[PDB]
Amino acid sequence: VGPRLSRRILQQARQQQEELEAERERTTRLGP
């Protein structure tokens, strides 16, 4: 295919994989 096209393809595939794997407040307290 080519370097740039395959890079865009893998980036979009990783984005879609993260989006489909997806479907608060930072814990500032060390001890409860």
Partner: protein, 738 residues
């Protein structure tokens, strides 16, 4: 700072780590990410130091985040993650595998944590990286080295995935994957590795492109802790089948396939030096290879040296135990007639066989060494032996000489003593090698023979000095070394009789004899340093022995200048600066000679004297030596230009340039200004890889056949990290090379 329990506890560190997991700035900010996983690495190190199982339990989430940041395009994050995970593996994982032990598929404690983090690195071996694969391979390699013996039942799938990765048409990480599989073979052991990925070269194959043919070089280069019993039970009948098929296709007319199988069989006994490195069952599995090694060393020359090398490998590191050494000795009583017939046969790789014979005779019993010495002595004394056979048996005598007791050494010396006056150079050379070998041992029967027969040896060496051939000078001086390092004080006459031989050997034909003569000059100096209370007066008494050699013959003059050069290079500060100055005046007088060898050795002595003594003492004699340099000659200046150039460079560097300019004429003025300008100017195993005519890393290449599935576990074979893709002939067809 690694705080103690009073400053930071294990539960507090775990709470800090779990609270610090929740930031992960964006993915690739690259300013706080490196220090971020650095501080979790340090906190995990401190947690393991405080409570190791808690740190191992907290490890897999940090390893998952390490994989996630290893997916980042920035290579600095890749390097930081690789260094952090390697440090965690080396310091927090490797020493704790002995306590945890083996891991199964149903582990519960920290073994389950090891399994989870190995699942994390297996997920890190997937296709989604395509630029960190060298880093993941290095992490896999250090994990294999750390936990091959303790993570054995689980990493077969990773080995299959690695074989699939190396089965790619264009793999730039071939060397890294080879190193990783080599570490896996080293620590795992190639037996269960071959159980996981089988070799497809078992007997008859319909094809010739073996997809796992690199396993044999991997096992050859990376086996150190594997039992020999697996080698005997697996590689013995497969060798016979492959060799039999090799001759069967050899006489069938198909030479290409026969040569391929010949390459296979010749490579698969190269695993034997690896398997003989540290075998865990060599006390019991070496019985089944004795007759195999005998038949492979008797009628199979093409393996012999390698087999000998394999034997040598064992003698390097397989004789640690006493039962192993006893078995090796008993099979030495089995093998020695075969090895002696192999070395003594007419023609042959005699050098490696002789080295193996010496190294193998140093670790056997004394009594059959004595018996073989009797046999070799009656073979030498037999007049019906040829000259080559006599030389071979004399080499066997040389090998058997230091391994015998005092009586056998004494009778061998009594037999060798009339042979020192023989007109044959080879016989006298072997006799002097025998005399060097029997005196080489500083302890044992050889030393007892040395002190028992010191006067007889001295008288024999003084008598045989007149009739010594030129090659025989090379070992004999070493023998003199072997009789000086334990010499008594009342032996000055013998030493000063030996001095002219050493000086004449400082310019001997062989450079090994010259090095031996220089070492012998050092040994005479050290021996005279022990024979007197005053070291400077003893050095002067050593020096008055060799100074009259500056008077007589021209080659003796050159030999004496070279001897004084080596002495000044070895006795710099202990002999006296004024003696160096007066010798410098003398050697400049010798610089004013006509013979090129004398003036060349004089230039060498002048350079060494410039190097040795201080510039304050040099400045008193710069004018004299440099005047002697200046009015030398026209042709002599032209011939050895570089020695005078280096001398002028040293004089410029160690002094002022103005006086150096003033003390030379116009041609040397041009030489000096050119030298000043020059000073101012100063201020992997594949066939095609060897035969080579000798941002950017983020590029990817897809290949489009079967449709591509990203979730297919074998899609990583279809992605490539790199770009895919003079003489004349005569009438007979022969090339012309010029």
């Amino acid at each position: 700072a690694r705080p103690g329990l009073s400053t930071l506890s294990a539960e507090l560190n775990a709470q800090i780590i779990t609270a610090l997991y929740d930031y992960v700035p964006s993915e690739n900010d690259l300013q706080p990410l490196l220090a971020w996983l650095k501080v979790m690495e340090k906190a995990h190190i401190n947690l393991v130091r405080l409570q190791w199982d808690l740190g191992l339990g907290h490890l897999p989430r940090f390893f998952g985040t390490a994989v996630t940041c290893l997916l980042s395009p920035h290579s600095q994050v890749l390097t930081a993650a690789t260094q952090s995970l390697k440090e965690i593996l080396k310091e927090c994982v490797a020493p704790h595998m002995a306590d945890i032990g083996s891991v199964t598929s149903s582990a519960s404690g920290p073994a389950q944590s090891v399994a989870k983090m190995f699942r994390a690195v297996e997920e890190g071996l997937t296709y989604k990286f395509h630029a960190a694969w060298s880093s993941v391979l290095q992490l896999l390699c250090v994990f294999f080295e750390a936990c091959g013996r303790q993570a054995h039942p689980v990493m077969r799938k990773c080995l299959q995935s690695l074989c699939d990765l190396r089965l790619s048409p264009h793999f730039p990480h071939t060397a890294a994957l080879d190193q990783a599989v080599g570490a896996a073979v080293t620590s795992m052991g190639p037996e269960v590795v071959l159980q996981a990925v089988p070799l497809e070269i078992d007997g008859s194959e319909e094809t010739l492109d073996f997809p796992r043919s690199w396993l044999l070089p991997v096992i050859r280069d990376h086996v150190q802790e594997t039992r020999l019993g697996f080698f005997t039970t697996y590689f013995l009948p497969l060798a016979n089948t492959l060799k039999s098929k090799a001759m069967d296709l050899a006489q069938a007319g198909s030479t290409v396939e026969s040569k391929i199988y010949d390459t296979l069989q010749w490579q698969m006994w190269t695993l034997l030096p690896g398997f003989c490195t540290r075998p865990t069952d060599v006390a019991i599995s070496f019985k089944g290879l004795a007759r195999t090694l005998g038949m492979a060393i008797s009628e199979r020359p093409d393996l012999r040296v390698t087999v000998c090398q394999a034997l040598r490998t064992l003698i390097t590191k397989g004789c640690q135990a006493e039962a192993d050494r006893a078995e090796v000795s008993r099979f030495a009583k089995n093998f020695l007639p075969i090895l002696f017939n192999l070395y003594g046969q007419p023609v042959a790789p005699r050098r490696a066989v002789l080295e193996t014979i010496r190294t193998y005779l140093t670790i056997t019993d004394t009594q059959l060494v004595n018996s073989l010495l009797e046999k070799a002595s009656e073979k030498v004394l037999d007049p019906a032996s040829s000259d080559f056979t006599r030389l071979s048996v004399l080499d066997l005598v040389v090998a058997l000489a230091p391994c015998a007791d005092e009586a056998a050494i004494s009778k061998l010396y009594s037999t060798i003593r009339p042979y020192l006056e023989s007109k044959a150079h080879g016989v006298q050379k072997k006799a002097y090698r025998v005399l060097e070998e029997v005196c080489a041992s500083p302890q044992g029967p050889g030393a007892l023979f040395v002190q028992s027969h010191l006067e007889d040896l001295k008288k024999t060496l003084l008598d045989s000095l007149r009739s010594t051939s030129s090659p025989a000078k090379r070992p004999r001086l070493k023998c003199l070394l072997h009789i000086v390092r334990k010499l008594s004080a009342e032996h000055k006459e013998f030493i000063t009789a030996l001095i002219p031989e050493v000086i004449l050997c400082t310019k001997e034909v062989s450079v090994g004899a010259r090095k031996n003569a220089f070492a012998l000059l050092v040994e005479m100096g050290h021996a005279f340093l022990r024979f007197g209370s005053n070291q400077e007066e003893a050095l002067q008494c050593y020096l008055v022995l060799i100074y009259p050699g500056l008077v007589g013959a021209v080659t003796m003059v050159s030999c004496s200048i070279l001897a004084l050069t080596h002495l000044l290079f070895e006795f710099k500060g202990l002999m006296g600066t004024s003696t160096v100055e007066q010798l410098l005046e003398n050697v400049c007088l010798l610089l004013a000679s006509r013979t090129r060898d004398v003036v060349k050795s004089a230039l060498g002595f002048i350079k060494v004297a410039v190097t040795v003594m201080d510039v304050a003492h040099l400045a008193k004699h710069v004018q004299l030596v440099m005047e002697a340099i200046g009015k030398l000659s026209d042709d002599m200046r032209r011939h050895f230009r570089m020695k005078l150039r280096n001398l002028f460079t040293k004089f410029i560097r160690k002094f002022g340039f103005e006086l150096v300019k003033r003390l030379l004429p116009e041609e040397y003025h041009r030489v000096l200004v050119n030298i000043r300008k020059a000073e101012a100017r100063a201020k992997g195993d594949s066939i095609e890889e060897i035969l080579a005519d000798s941002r950017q890393r983020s590029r990817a290449w897809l290949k489009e056949d079967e449709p591509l599935n990203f979730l297919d576990p074998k899609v990583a074979q279809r992605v490539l990290a790199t770009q895919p893709g003079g003489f004349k002939v005569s009438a007979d067809g022969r090339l012309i090379i010029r």
